[PDB]
Write a protein that binds this ligand. Structure first.
Ligand SMILES: [Mg+2]
Ligand SMILES: [Mg+2]
Ligand SMILES: [Mg+2]
Ligand SMILES: [Mg+2]
Ligand SMILES: [Mg+2]
Ligand SMILES: [Mg+2]
Ligand SMILES: [Mg+2]
Ligand SMILES: [Mg+2]
Ligand SMILES: [Mg+2]
Ligand SMILES: [Mg+2]
Ligand SMILES: [Mg+2]
Ligand SMILES: [Mg+2]
Ligand SMILES: [Mg+2]
Ligand SMILES: [Mg+2]
Ligand SMILES: [Mg+2]
Ligand SMILES: [Mg+2]
Ligand SMILES: [Mg+2]
Ligand SMILES: [Mg+2]
Ligand SMILES: [Mg+2]
Ligand SMILES: [Mg+2]
Ligand SMILES: [Mg+2]
Ligand SMILES: [Mg+2]
Ligand SMILES: [Mg+2]
Ligand SMILES: [Mg+2]
Ligand SMILES: [Mg+2]
Ligand SMILES: [Mg+2]
Ligand SMILES: [Mg+2]
Ligand SMILES: [Mg+2]
Ligand SMILES: [Mg+2]
Ligand SMILES: [Mg+2]
Ligand SMILES: [Mg+2]
Ligand SMILES: [Mg+2]
Ligand SMILES: [Mg+2]
Ligand SMILES: [Mg+2]
Ligand SMILES: [Mg+2]
Lengths: 121, 252, 52, 233
RNA sequence: UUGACAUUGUGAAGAGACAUAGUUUCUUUACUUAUUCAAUGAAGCGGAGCUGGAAUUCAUUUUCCACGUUCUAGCAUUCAAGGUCCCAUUCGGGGCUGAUCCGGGUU
RNA sequence: GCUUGUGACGGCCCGUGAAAAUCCACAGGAAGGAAUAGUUUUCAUGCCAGGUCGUACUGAUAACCGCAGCAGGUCUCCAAG
RNA sequence: GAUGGGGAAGCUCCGUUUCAAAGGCCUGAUUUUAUGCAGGCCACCAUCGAAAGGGAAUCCGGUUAAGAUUCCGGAACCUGG
């Protein structure tokens, strides 16, 4: 017979089969356990006299919160560690290089009430 | 002794072009099928100033033989071409101002611009505001075509070499006194860093072959050998005469 | 312009929010005439091919 | 007819976008392609010495068809076949007390370059097929001379792979017969003769004949019509 | 920068020696594959043919050129509409032609 | 009136005074779409979510650079009678 | 300033789309099923480089020893879904 019929002047790299990895020994024997769980995410209360104010007047809980952790993660690990519901979470890095969550609870909850359930005062 | 000025320009530090505002590079069409078997229409669409350029450019757009779409070219405007004018490019194309034609097809005495050294090099000869070349005869076997360039030189190139019919626009620009230093200044500001110019004769000797002395003087013949070496060639390089050119010039 | 309903971005003629109406008028006339004088170029030089 | 319409389409410079065509003439092949094509070209433009060029003169398809047809019968042992042979004699021989000769003499095609050379050298080979490819051509260029001087008849045959099939390698380079079942001796003598005629007989004259020096067609025609006009008006 | 040698090959005419058979060497001038330069999303190259027709026929073609676009600041894309052949008639879809043949040397 | 913003103009050039992300529009018409009921989210209303790092103060005859709480140096906005 | 490359004994130098087989979107084909093939495109060939250039969208009141166009109040707007 005879030849191909390429209508394009450009020759391109044949789109050839990409085989997926099916290994033979494992990557690491044991996967890592969860590196940022709810307990590691939210480290202590912040009971500064001016912070407590934000709890009586603010319906706001203030935590020293792991630097590795974003608002999403602060919100969950609060909601989870404490049964409470969260409105919004503002955050900030302190001058001693530790992160501070300003956690606002929804109106259904009283934070000041919830503060001294966890125990501080 | 120091590296003199003129050897420093080779590394192009502060000496590269001031390219930032330029319309693009000015070139004829690619030498495609259309243009060497027939003609192809375009429209000049804009004739526009180029920074650092004597002569205006003409933005001319064409259809694309091979794909549905406009493809645009940057032409140096020959005098008298205008917006909206139809431009015809190609072997079998007519002898009007603004068309591009292969030097082969135009009678001697024709006056063209932006002409190719070799076919399809997209245009090399006579591009400065005011210049042109003149066909001064052809030798049909080995299709050559003899032209005289602006310099006065005659050179003989392929007949297939394209050229655009006319003279380049903006002629006369140099008839006008700059008058002040500033207009020079603003001129080179858009060319390159060559202005102003310290007389080598006002430098110390580290600086220049002309430098030093207790009075200012070149101190030795200022006609330098072709075979001189970098750091020597400052003066009148290879000058085969010197002094006030008396008498008419004009190549014979 | 994406925070805004399409009528703020056109007018109701052909080439609405794109060309300036007189500018359309022109290319309507020119289109028509040129497609005509085409027919006139056709049959005239068709004649020529037989009358020579 | 209906409300259907004949429009044609003017594809004649300055109008209608060009249609899609076959540009297979023009495509920008990968370098590795452009190399192997132009290598074959360069190898033709150069006048090639008579001791190469005596290749390219290959066998013809028919005689070789007959020659593969033979050589096939005498293929070497298959993996199994010899396993099978061994599990015969090993069990058998060692007991029945035959002298490692409860196996029949094997008639097979001789192969492998170095093996066959000593065969030619020893005038034991009786019809040698030489490949026509073989990229360090040196492995083989001295073989026509050898076979000629050892009075061994030979043939340059198309396909190092095709030689390789009849021996169960991918490629072979050479294949030879030294033995033959008398039931085939006749076929081979006839085969041998044609081959000798086409090669070992013609050898000496081929040794005088340079190769290539061939123009490509853009410049073939260039002078087939330069020399057409100039001389005979 | 200038010379030689190496890269370095292929024709042809002309000079030069065993001393007016051609192995060999240079002056010329050819060749193109080494080397070199320009170009382009390697797009239309070379070769033949169709048709037109200038051409003048010394038996008939011996040739040479062509062989889709120029009043206008429009429009030009969906393997093309057409024509024709198939799928087993669904809606879709496929070939061929339209767009001549040959050589895969991008020019 | 002052400062500033803006506009329709006018002077100047051998100077004619960035780019790109991004957004929209139009030409095109592939294709998809109803009457026993289809198309429509560039019209209105309605639901959810928006991470990470900076954010204090000085900016100078004492928070900067000049061995210093140095008569030096060090970019800018606001501007009453 | 990486990369196919080319230099360099070499640390490295050159080149930035350049003598490179350079890559990815839209959906269809699945009703073994999760995504192979079916087209058609598009050949754009890294990336860093502006807290004064470009740029989606917030305001007023109130509040602190010290934070605010960031919190409270109220009223909006943008982007994605
Ligand atoms: Mg309360
Ligand atoms: Mg923050
Ligand atoms: Mg530059
Ligand atoms: Mg200067
Ligand atoms: Mg001076
Ligand atoms: Mg001077
Ligand atoms: Mg001095
Ligand atoms: Mg001197
Ligand atoms: Mg000196
Ligand atoms: Mg001096
Ligand atoms: Mg003086
Ligand atoms: Mg409107
Ligand atoms: Mg057998
Ligand atoms: Mg020389
Ligand atoms: Mg090309
Ligand atoms: Mg001001
Ligand atoms: Mg202006
Ligand atoms: Mg818009
Ligand atoms: Mg479809
Ligand atoms: Mg909406
Ligand atoms: Mg994300
Ligand atoms: Mg502040
Ligand atoms: Mg102070
Ligand atoms: Mg200090
Ligand atoms: Mg001070
Ligand atoms: Mg680099
Ligand atoms: Mg960046
Ligand atoms: Mg910025
Ligand atoms: Mg900015
Ligand atoms: Mg306030
Ligand atoms: Mg506070
Ligand atoms: Mg403050
Ligand atoms: Mg608020
Ligand atoms: Mg609200
Ligand atoms: Mg929305």
């Amino acid at each position: 017979k005879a030849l191909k019929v390429r209508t394009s002047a450009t020759f391109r790299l044949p789109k050839t089969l990409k085989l997926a990895r099916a290994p033979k020994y494992a990557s690491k024997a044991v996967p890592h356990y969860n590196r940022l769980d709810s307990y590691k995410v939210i480290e202590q209360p912040i009971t500064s006299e001016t912070a407590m104010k934000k709890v009586e007047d603010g319906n706001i809980l203030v935590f020293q919160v792991s630097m590795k952790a974003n608002k999403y993660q602060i919100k969950k690990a609060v909601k989870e560690l404490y049964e409470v519901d969260v409105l919004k979470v503002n955050t900030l890095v302190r001058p001693n290089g530790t992160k501070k969550a300003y956690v606002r609870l929804t109106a259904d909850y009283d934070a000041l009430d919830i503060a001294n359930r966890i125990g501080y005062i | 002794g120091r590296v003199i000025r003129n050897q420093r320009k080779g590394a192009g530090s502060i000496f590269t072009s001031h390219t930032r505002l330029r319309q693009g590079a000015a070139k004829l069409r690619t030498l495609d099928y259309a243009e060497r078997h027939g003609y192809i229409r375009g429209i000049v669409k804009q004739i526009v100033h180029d920074s650092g350029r004597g002569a205006p450019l003409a933005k001319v757009v064409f259809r694309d033989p091979y794909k549905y779409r406009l493809r645009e070219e940057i032409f140096i405007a020959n005098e008298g071409v205008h917006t909206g004018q139809f431009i015809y490019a190609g072997k079998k194309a007519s002898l009007n101002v603004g068309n591009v034609l292969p030097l082969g097809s135009v009678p001697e005495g024709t006056i063209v611009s932006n002409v190719e050294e070799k076919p399809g090099d997209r245009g090399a000869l006579a591009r400065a505001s005011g210049n042109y070349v003149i066909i001064i005869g052809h030798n049909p076997d080995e299709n050559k075509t003899r032209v005289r360039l602006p310099s006065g030189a005659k050179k003989v190139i392929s007949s297939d070499a394209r050229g655009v019919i006319g003279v380049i626009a903006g002629g006369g620009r140099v008839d006008k006194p700059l008058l002040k230093a500033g207009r020079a200044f603003h001129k080179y500001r858009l060319k390159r860093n060559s202005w102003p110019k310290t007389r080598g004769v006002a430098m110390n000797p580290v600086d220049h072959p002309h430098g030093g002395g207790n009075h200012q003087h070149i101190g030795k013949a200022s006609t330098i050998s072709r075979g001189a070496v970098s750091g020597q060639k400052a003066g009148l390089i290879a000058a085969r005469r010197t002094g006030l050119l008396r008498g008419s010039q004009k190549t014979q | 312009y994406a925070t805004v309903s399409k009528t703020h971005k056109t007018v109701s003629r052909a080439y609405g929010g794109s060309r300036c109406a007189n500018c359309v008028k022109e290319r309507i006339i020119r289109a028509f005439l040129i497609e005509e004088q085409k027919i006139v170029k056709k049959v005239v030089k068709e004649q020529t091919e037989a009358a020579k | 007819n209906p409300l259907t319409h004949s429009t044609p389409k003017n594809f004649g410079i300055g109008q209608a976008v060009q249609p899609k065509r076959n540009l297979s003439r023009y495509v920008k092949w990968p370098e590795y392609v452009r190399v192997q094509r132009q290598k074959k070209i360069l190898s033709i433009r150069l006048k090639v010495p008579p001791t190469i060029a005596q290749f390219q003169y290959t066998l013809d398809r028919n005689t070789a068809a007959e020659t593969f047809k033979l050589f096939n019968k005498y293929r070497p042992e298959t993996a199994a076949e010899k396993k099978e042979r061994l599990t015969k004699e090993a069990a058998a021989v060692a007991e029945g007390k035959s002298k490692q000769d409860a196996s029949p003499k094997p008639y097979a095609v001789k192969y492998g370059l170095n093996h066959v050379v000593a065969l030619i050298e020893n005038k034991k080979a009786k019809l040698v097929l030489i490949a026509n490819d073989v990229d360090p051509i040196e492995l083989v260029v001295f073989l026509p001379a050898l076979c000629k001087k050892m009075g061994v008849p030979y043939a340059i045959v198309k396909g190092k792979a095709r030689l390789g099939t009849l021996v169960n390698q991918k490629t072979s380079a050479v294949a030879a017969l030294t033995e033959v079942r008398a039931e085939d001796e006749a076929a081979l003598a006839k085969l041998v003769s044609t081959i000798d005629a086409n090669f070992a007989d013609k050898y000496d004259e081929v040794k005088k004949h340079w190769g290539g020096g061939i123009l490509g067609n853009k410049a073939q025609a260039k002078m087939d019509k330069r020399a057409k006009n100039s001389d005979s008006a």
